[PDB]
């Protein structure tokens, strides 16, 4: 149904809301939720752990089956697997983990995976355990994504800093 409500429109195609991505998925019933994935689709932490828990581990079981046959993703890459109870599809997208020395330049490749989907519910890529500057990630999102992206930021203080930064 893609019933996004209460978003702030930043650009013609980028929207943001102070919200929990799991509660947004349940409310909105998106066609596609983006996972903040790692290359082995091991969803023990970060947004990936929250999504997986909300699928009662179905996302991890599917991901383990996928990886054993298909091999890992690349940093900046993606795959499309089931959205389970959260969405029709899950676009697993690997942003660079700058806490572990990966190239922040790959955040552009990471966001280019969104352009194959008309509308997405998504987290800010490379935030949290991936260690990237969120203000930078929002800029790369706005510069790179052409399709409609609805970003969910749960931390209110970070949300407020992102909106204040974007309106400068
Ligand atoms: C949760 C869920 C499941 C199946 C779904 N299909 C669609 C669609 O856009 O056709 C959205 C959606 C959301």
Curated annotation (Swiss-Prot):
Superkingdom of this protein's organism: Viruses
Catalytic activity entry: Thiol-dependent hydrolysis of ester, thioester, amide, peptide and isopeptide bonds formed by the C-terminal Gly of ubiquitin (a 76-residue protein attached to proteins as an intracellular targeting signal)
Regulation: Inhibited in vitro by GRL-0617.
Subcellular location: Host endoplasmic reticulum membrane
Membrane topology: Multi-pass membrane protein
Domain Macro: 1-168
Subunit and interaction comment: May form homohexamers. Interacts with N protein.
Functional description taken from the UniProt entry: Responsible for the cleavages located at the N-terminus of the replicase polyprotein. Participates together with nsp4 in the assembly of virally-induced cytoplasmic double-membrane vesicles necessary for viral replication. Antagonizes innate immune induction of type I interferon by blocking the phosphorylation, dimerization and subsequent nuclear translocation of host IRF3. Also prevents host NF-kappa-B signaling. In addition, PL-PRO possesses a deubiquitinating/deISGylating activity and processes both 'Lys-48'- and 'Lys-63'-linked polyubiquitin chains from cellular substrates.
Name this polypeptide is given: Papain-like protease nsp3
Native source organism of the sequence: Severe acute respiratory syndrome coronavirus 2 (2019-nCoV)
Part of the whole protein covered: 1025 to 1192 of 7096
């Amino acid at each position: 149904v893609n019933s996004f409500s209460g978003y702030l429109k930043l650009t013609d195609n980028v929207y943001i809301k102070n919200a929990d991505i799991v509660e947004e998925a349940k409310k909105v019933k998106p066609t596609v939720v983006v996972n903040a994935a790692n290359v082995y689709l091991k969803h023990g932490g970060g947004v990936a752990g929250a999504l997986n828990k909300a699928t009662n581990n179905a996302m991890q079981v599917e991901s383990d089956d996928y990886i054993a046959t298909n091999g890992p993703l690349k940093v900046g890459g993606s795959c499309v697997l089931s959205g389970h109870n959260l969405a029709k599809h899950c676009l697993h997208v690997v942003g660079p983990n700058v806490n572990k020395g990966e190239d922040i330049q790959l955040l552009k490749s990471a966001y280019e995976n969104f352009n194959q989907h008309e509308v997405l519910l998504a987290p800010l890529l490379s935030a949290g355990i991936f260690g990237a500057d969120p203000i930078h990630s929002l800029r790369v999102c706005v510069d790179t994504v052409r399709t409609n992206v609805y970003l969910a930021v749960f931390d209110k203080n970070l949300y407020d800093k992102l909106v204040s930064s974007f309106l400068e």
